[PDB]
Design a protein around this ligand. Structure first.
Ligand SMILES: CC(=O)N[C@@H]1[C@@H](O[C@@H]2O[C@H](C(=O)O)[C@@H](O[C@@H]3O[C@H](CO)[C@H](OS(=O)(=O)O)[C@H](O[C@@H]4OC(C(=O)O)=C[C@H](O)[C@H]4O)[C@H]3NC(C)=O)[C@H](O)[C@H]2O)[C@@H](OS(=O)(=O)O)[C@@H](CO)O[C@H]1O
Ligand code: NA
Length: 754
């Protein structure tokens, strides 16, 4: 491939990142995209350093601070983008062009050149600048000289001599993985178009192949659909999206060319659209539990990341077979149509606007999110859906860290892995509307928590420490899931708790047992901590209302249920006191992120909790949540033994769903919960239909070679579906012995016949 092939590739990249070939004349959404492009460009030009002998390019960005060096270059690439976009205010403006070129020249002289040693964050030198400088070279190819290309290519190659590796020489270079491998290869591929270097381009394309190979440990995509980055943090929602965005752009750029991605194993990446990304997308937002430290970012939210995932999926769909293309488009049309809270076209780029308009022009109908359970045992995450709600559980374990903090971000997030219950609903802004600026980080919804104050960055940055717990895991059969977590508290308090969740098509039953701590402080379990925005949403009870006055906590009477206007119902399944607090909380994003604005946000919350007191001995809880339930339905939850607690202690936790005729259990020790037994740790769901017993089983430690169940509902003599060996115990009960060697927490489905 020669000069013409390289020119064609550069032109395609410019088409992709500007949308210049696809602007629809007089379209109001295109006009808004150009306006947003114009305002950003105008803002940057206003900040140009015009001083003779300047030592920065922008008066508000120091080249001695590596993050401000990156922003220098992204502003320059944004300006080049505007200069190349028909109808933009600066389109083809020679004075603006001259200022971009002078900015690239001086940033190179002053700072980013092939003699400079890295200082500060490696990512700035190897990913932040190269992607932006490469884009600027390609955008400005007709305008930069050969000597300018030589200088800038040399700078990039100095920092990134091989995109299969990362870190400066003084650190020891390691294999780049996952999102980092995609980003380093993107910067080198685009730089290879500017410099017409087929050898670097081929090597960078070949480097993409690693990122979609299945892994069983470390970083990458697991066969169950989990995606981990930084070894111990569930990360589909932020690093997974960086990977998805970069591969969508690169696949589209190279398709049909001499450099096309041709590795057939990229099918694993395509399978991940539904296998990994779709289940953790909720009405257009990536779930908070899979986006790690980005929850602390005011302007990199679940909806910003979901909108990037939608753009990428739409871009990939163009190359797919017809049925897959239509399925992915349907998924996207649904995540777009249902999101009235941060509509995807508000502040969308011109390319994103074009993909959204192209989708609308297909007339492909919106696909609803399927009810039911999606389990990700490799990353200790589960998703559950019913009409009007999605529950995301956030666990941690000897495989998965309590939280990631780093770079001044999410240093307060140390309870976010303590069994959080995120109930996403039609309140689309629940977790987005300054929730992470104002929420009580010691009373996040669903957690059990030792009230000992912990320092920011407790347990270390980058997910370096994990709880040395017994297990966390899950299984599901049909409409019912069983999820368990042995919580070990962060900050060496000695907090221990056995938390389980049994989740039907409508209600979530939350059991807790064996709670104690060594710190001497009170321990709490949070039934909910729910953002009311500026609302005064009524908490209704059997007697009337509760917590009508902000700041004064009240104890629920003996009706045992409370209904929150705009949400649904909560009910206690034991006689423990439920404390209910209406509160107003304030905070700034600067309080949770070094880059956050100083603006103070104020939000109203409803906070419902159980107090286990000081020095609990085998403390416990039992309650349920019924998202979307009316007051009438909430008042009835505890009638008729619909949610029948079987056992809730240090051996096992189990509940029967009367209407679903289905029982769910978690086992901590060998023993029986009702008429089901297990020989060791297990998650089980079972249901009898006449003369047939259906079971789902997982071995949640991921380390046991076998597991034996003592079967409920009488004796069983044949296996109809699945694997396992039937047997009989000393007491005449049927047993099922499973080989669980290497199952990695996955579920086995079995059907038996009497
Ligand atoms: C300083 C150091 O040595 N730390 C490493 C740690 O490296 C840190 O982690 C990541 C990484 O690439 O591995 C890198 O995260 C990315 O940081 C930039 C800014 O630096 C962006 O964050 S933001 O500016 O606050 O938004 C970036 O965000 C994402 O940006 C983009 C995009 O640029 O296209 C898309 C998304 O919308 C957005 O979420 C952020 N990525 C994400 C997904 O958050 C840090 O800069 C880097 O310092 C790890 O290094 S690793 O290579 O081994 O993985 C860590 C692992 O244990 O080791 C530490 O020592
Ligand atoms: Na980590």
């Amino acid at each position: 491939p020669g000069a013409a092939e390289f020119a064609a590739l550069r032109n395609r990249w410019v088409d992709q990142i500007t949308g210049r070939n696809v602007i629809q004349a007089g379209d109001p959404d295109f006009a808004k995209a150009i306006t947003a492009l114009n305002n950003k460009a105008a803002d940057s030009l206003a900040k140009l350093d015009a001083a003779a002998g300047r030592t920065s390019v922008f008066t508000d960005l120091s080249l001695a601070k590596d993050a401000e060096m990156v922003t220098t270059y992204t502003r320059l690439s944004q300006l080049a983008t505007a200069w190349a976009t028909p109808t933009a205010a600066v389109f083809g403006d020679a004075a603006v062009l001259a200022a971009i070129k002078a900015g690239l020249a001086d940033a190179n002289t002053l700072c980013y050149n092939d003699r400079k040693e890295e200082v500060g964050n490696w990512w700035s030198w190897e990913i932040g600048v190269p992607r932006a400088l490469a884009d600027a070279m390609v955008l400005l190819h007709a305008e930069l000289s050969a000597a300018e290309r030589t200088a800038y290519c040399a700078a990039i190659d100095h920092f990134v001599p091989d995109p299969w590796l990362q870190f400066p020489p003084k650190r020891g270079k390691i294999t780049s993985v996952g999102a980092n491998r995609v980003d380093l290869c993107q910067g080198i591929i685009i730089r290879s178009l500017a410099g017409e270097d087929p050898t670097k381009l081929n090597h960078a394309v070949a480097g993409l192949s690693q990122v979609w190979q299945y892994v069983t440990s470390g970083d990458g995509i697991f066969r169950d659909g989990s995606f981990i980055q930084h070894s111990t943090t569930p990360y589909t929602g932020s690093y997974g999206v960086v990977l998805l965005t970069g591969l969508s752009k690169l696949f589209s750029l190279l398709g049909g060319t001499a450099f096309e991605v041709s590795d057939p194993t990229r099918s694993i990446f395509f399978d991940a659209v539904e296998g990994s990304f779709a289940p953790v997308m909720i009405n257009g937002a990536m779930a908070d539990a899979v986006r790690g430290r980005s929850i602390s970012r005011e302007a990199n939210t679940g909806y910003d990341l979901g909108a990037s995932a939608i753009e990428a999926i739409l871009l990939l769909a163009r190359a797919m077979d017809p049925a897959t293309a239509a399925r992915w488009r349907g998924l996207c049309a649904g995540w777009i149509a249902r999101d009235t809270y941060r509509p995807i076209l508000n502040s969308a780029s011109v390319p994103r606007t074009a993909l959204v308009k192209q989708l609308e022009a297909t007339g492909v109908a919106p696909v609803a999110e399927a009810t039911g359970h999606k389990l990700f045992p490799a990353m200790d995450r589960t998703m559950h859906r019913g009409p009007g709600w999605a529950l995301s559980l956030a666990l941690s374990s000897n495989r998965i860290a309590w939280y990631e903090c780093g770079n001044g971000e999410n240093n307060r997030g140390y309870h976010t892995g303590s069994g959080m219950t995120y109930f996403y609903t039609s309140d689309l802004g629940q977790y987005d509307d300054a929730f992470w600026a104002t929420a009580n980080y010691n009373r996040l919804p669903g957690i059990t928590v030792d009230t000992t104050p912990l320092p920011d960055k407790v347990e270390g940055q980058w997910g370096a420490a994990v709880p040395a717990d017994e297990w966390s895991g899950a299984t599901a059969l049909g409409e019912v899931a069983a999820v368990g977590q042995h919580l070990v508290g962060p900050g060496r308090t000695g907090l221990t708790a056995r938390k389980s969740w049994f989740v039907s098509g409508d209600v979530t039953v939350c059991l807790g047992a064996d709670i104690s701590t060594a710190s001497g402080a009170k321990v709490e379990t949070i039934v909910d901590h729910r953002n009311l925005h500026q609302g005064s949403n009524t908490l209704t009870t059997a007697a009337g209302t509760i917590a009508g006055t902000a700041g004064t906590v009240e104890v629920l009477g003996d009706g045992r249920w409370v209904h929150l206007e705009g949400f649904g119902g909560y009910a206690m399944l034991d006689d423990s006191p439920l404390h209910v607090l209406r509160e107003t909380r304030s905070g700034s994003w600067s309080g949770v992120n070094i880059n956050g604005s100083a603006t103070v946000q104020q939000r109203n919350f409803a906070t419902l909790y159980v107090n286990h007191g000081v020095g609990p001995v085998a403390g416990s809880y039992a309650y349920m949540v019924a998202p979307g339930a009316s007051v009438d339905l909430t008042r009835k939850l505890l009638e008729g033994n619909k949610y029948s607690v079987i056992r809730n202690d240090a051996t096992a936790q189990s509940v029967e769903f009367k209407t679903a005729k289905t029982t769910a259990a978690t086992f901590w020790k060998p023993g029986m919960a009702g008429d089901l037994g297990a020989s060791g740790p297990a998650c089980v769901v079972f249901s009898r239909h006449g003369n047939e017993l259906s079971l789902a089983v997982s071995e949640p430690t991921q380390k046991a070679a076998g597991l034996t169940l003592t079967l409920p509902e009488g004796t069983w003599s044949s296996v109809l579906e699945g694997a396992g060996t039937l047997g009989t115990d000393a007491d005449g009960r049927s047993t099922l012995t499973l080989d669980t060697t290497g199952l990695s927490g996955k579920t086995k489905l079995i059907k038996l016949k009497r």
